[PDB]
Amino acid sequence: QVADAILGNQMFTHYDRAHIAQLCEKAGLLQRALEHFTDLYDIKRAVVHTHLLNPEWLVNYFGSLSVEDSLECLRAMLSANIRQNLQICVQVASKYHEQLSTQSLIELFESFKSFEGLFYFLGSIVNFSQDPDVHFKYIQAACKTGQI
């Protein structure tokens, strides 16, 4: 109970992250576990579990942010395509896309179904932005379920 608070206080800075992580690992303390996971980066395990577990949110943002391996996260999300991470994945699209609106990103959306979420997402973003073709592929997606 006092672990998180101490973590914000001085345990994080003076106690040594990997060990603490290991302990939390053995503990499975997801708010803290996630912190450690971030710090201990067994990323595959951290992603699988967060999709699985009913997760904390801010930490989610940071780990999501923390890191051009959202490639890995999407891969997990596709493995674990749950309605949870779809719009969520879109949300954090406005976390990684917003720093680099990568075509690779939009591509992987198109890789599987291209349902709604990144579609809606560049609904406003690459909209008011250039690509005729993104608009076009966008339209085509809007043709997956045509809604004139």
Side-chain angles (χ1 to χ4, degrees):
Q1 292 309 355
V2 74
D4 183 61
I6 293 169
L7 180 62
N9 291 22
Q10 199 179 12
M11 184 171 77
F12 179 79
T13 70
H14 295 187
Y15 184 15
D16 313 332
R17 207 55 188 63
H19 307 91
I20 88 167
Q22 290 174 355
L23 290 172
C24 193
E25 181 180 359
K26 292 179 180 179
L29 300 177
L30 291 172
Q31 178 272 355
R32 291 176 181 83
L34 291 173
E35 288 300 307
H36 97 295
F37 280 109
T38 299
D39 294 291
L40 220 55
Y41 62 80
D42 210 17
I43 296 299
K44 181 178 178 181
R45 291 80 181 176
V47 299
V48 303
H49 288 296
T50 175
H51 62 71
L52 291 172
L53 68 99
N54 309 334
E56 54 177 351
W57 181 86
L58 179 61
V59 172
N60 182 64
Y61 293 152
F62 178 78
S64 53
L65 181 61
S66 300
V67 60
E68 201 260 351
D69 299 329
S70 38
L71 312 55
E72 303 326 297
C73 165
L74 61 87
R75 293 148 51 274
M77 172 40 179
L78 171 75
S79 64
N81 30 0
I82 321 299
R83 276 55 54 202
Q84 327 173 21
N85 207 339
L86 337 148
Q87 70 304 352
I88 288 330
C89 195
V90 194
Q91 169 163 57
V92 298
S94 44
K95 265 188 70 66
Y96 164 80
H97 171 101
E98 69 189 7
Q99 60 207 356
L100 58 176
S101 284
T102 56
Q103 71 292 23
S104 50
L105 165 147
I106 59 192
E107 290 318 358
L108 303 171
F109 183 90
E110 178 147 48
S111 306
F112 315 115
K113 192 272 160 190
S114 82
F115 73 123
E116 164 84 19
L118 210 177
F119 187 71
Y120 291 108
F121 175 69
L122 314 185
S124 168
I125 319 169
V126 79
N127 175 60
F128 330 126
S129 320
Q130 83 289 17
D131 182 9
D133 312 336
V134 77
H135 299 62
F136 174 77
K137 306 319 214 168
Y138 197 81
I139 294 165
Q140 173 278 325
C143 318
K144 298 271 211 55
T145 76
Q147 219 188 1
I148 61 152

